[PDB]
Amino acid sequence: ALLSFERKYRVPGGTLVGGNLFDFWVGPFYVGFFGVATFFFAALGIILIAWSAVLQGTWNPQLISVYPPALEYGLGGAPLAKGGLWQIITICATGAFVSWALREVEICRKLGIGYHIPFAFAFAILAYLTLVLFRPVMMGAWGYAFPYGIWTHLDWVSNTGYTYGNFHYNPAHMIAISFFFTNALALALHGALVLSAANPEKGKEMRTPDHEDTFFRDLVGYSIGTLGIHRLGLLLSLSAVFFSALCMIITGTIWFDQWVDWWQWWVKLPWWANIPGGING
């Protein structure tokens, strides 16, 4: 059905590909050419995921796992049962994700709005492709990519992390961690501030943005603003994911020893590498 204000917005046009051919809705969902592609790659992927689960022997969703080729195949193709399906699913997964982002661009064009959302999304498509494509290719094998399985993708994280000692010491990991923590701080605050103005003390009239800006200033001496806080959230989360892909692209490629030891560059700086005392020497 339709939102009470929605009919006036469902005008033709804005499509990127195919004109009026797929310019329609199914229920609340806008289709478009790229709606069709998404559903295609999704349906394909799901089919192969269910297939893979047949060759594996289990229908339990907590055990289905699709594994990348062995390291022995390097970057070539592998038999479906011994690595090929991950290769296809990964193609479909990418299909579905890129079609999803393009489909959002079409929705943006119809609505007359900015493309900030599909732009932001693409940073996540970026991270995924880092893990399953850029890092493996640069390392010389698809075996270095994570497997599609609920708990088995978590075992990949432990074993990859622990190959380099405590992964905490990856300097880019550190920064990435920070942006993730701060984004959450920032969200909790924005969410609380809007709502504390919209829903004031009982019986009081709605506060204004003026009250919003006064609150932050009273509390920490500075208020970023109402446009600024949205600029800041978009920016914190995009950087968080950006440094994530960066922390993983350098791991195993340019740096492959233990991350804790990378920090010796600082301790061994020549003007103090040898003063005794402290922890080092």
Add this chain to the structure above:
Amino acid sequence: EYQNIFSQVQVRGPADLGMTEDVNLANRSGVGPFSTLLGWFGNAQLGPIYLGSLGVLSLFSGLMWFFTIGIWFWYQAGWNPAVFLRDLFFFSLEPPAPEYGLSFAAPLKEGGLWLIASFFMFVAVWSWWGRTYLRAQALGMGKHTAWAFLSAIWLWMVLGFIRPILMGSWSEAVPYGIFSHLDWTNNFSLVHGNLFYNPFHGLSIAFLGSALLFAMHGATILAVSRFGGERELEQIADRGTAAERAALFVRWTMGFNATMEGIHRWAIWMAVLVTLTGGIGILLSGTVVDNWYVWGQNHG
């Protein structure tokens, strides 16, 4: 096209002393300067801050904590600046030995100093918490910030206070150091058998969720700032085309709906649930559950 990530032109007027309501105006600083640097991203006005009894208590108490730690870092450095700067990430102020259990008898040089710095942090944070409830109350606003803040306080209290007491010694608490608090984290997970099998860890991950939500939300309000959608409160009281088209992106893309106020309820809860669940995951770790791998094998 123009993307609205940085302001194009900056206007300035007289410094804004702010809404009065029931605030005690005798506790606001002079307006600080104006950062044209900051002006491209957000507001350019620094100050005025509000400092009263609790604000000083907090600020003072929090510096005391900060110094007690940093003193120790000079003791470890042999009072040598070169060393200090070299091993900065490596110094660490550690909790009392296990022997001292929960007593306050530990020598200064063996976690008596930790206990002092902890006490100061305990005053500073709880002071600051009462500060966030009272700054809102004086403006007539709901206390959503104090309650959301209480969620982070929850995790911190479990980590350094509630769980140590439940375990029976201060040694279970987090030390004060850069690299050393990192190793406590790795250590904790190993001892309890992979925190990855702690189901509360896993949800706390899912909520950390907030990157996605605030990516989407920030992206949207920018996408609809051509209709002044950043003005969210008056879009709540009198829905305009910004709120209508932002609802329709959500609805046409993935099928459900978000109101202008509604999405901030989504936002505050996504965020608070990170530390709310996480505190439960740590609290149960070692007090109730010794090995999360072993636990997941029976679910009991």
Add this chain to the structure above:
Amino acid sequence: DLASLAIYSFWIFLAGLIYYLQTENMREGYPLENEDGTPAANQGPFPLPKPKTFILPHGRGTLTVPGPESEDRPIALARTAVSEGFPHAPTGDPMKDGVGPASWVARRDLPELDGHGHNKIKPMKAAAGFHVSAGKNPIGLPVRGCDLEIAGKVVDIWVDIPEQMARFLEVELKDGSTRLLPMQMVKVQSNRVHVNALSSDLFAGIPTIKSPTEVTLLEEDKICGYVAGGLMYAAPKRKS
């Protein structure tokens, strides 16, 4: 055991929370309608929430939501198919008519006020103490359309006073009248302001305001909606 108890208790709380959160995002746009405006059969799984009421500051009434929903304006569209789910073609000029990317909402024909009860947006000529502090001052600059033709010139900046930001460009058209252009929809350049969304002939089309020193919530939507709509509808006259 005790941890298993903690985790079912949580998943139950979470289900109640999702339900709460879900019904809160139904206070606007519901009940669902058919394309002909009558109430849709299937309204979805959750019910409507108990109506909450805002008290608008400055004695401006209240708002109870959810409340009765009408567009309070005429919609110049028509069906293009015989079944639900298809687009609705404009029956006139979609920018003149205010449909599609050019839609506006019938908001209160009142200006938004600041917390002290004053107009929130004032032309800078009439907002004391305000000036351009960094960046290029657009006042004096000529305004250019997406057909690379000059449509007018900037004669003032309309400024948010409590938030201290630019909001509109008062562009003086060639007949001597002005219009407001959203700040978010122009590119201030070193020798010109550039408007990709409107060709030069559609500038006189921009909705005009009544009081020369103030702009209402309605006038804001009609202007921003018109300028945004040109992105789609002015495309037959644009290069790059």
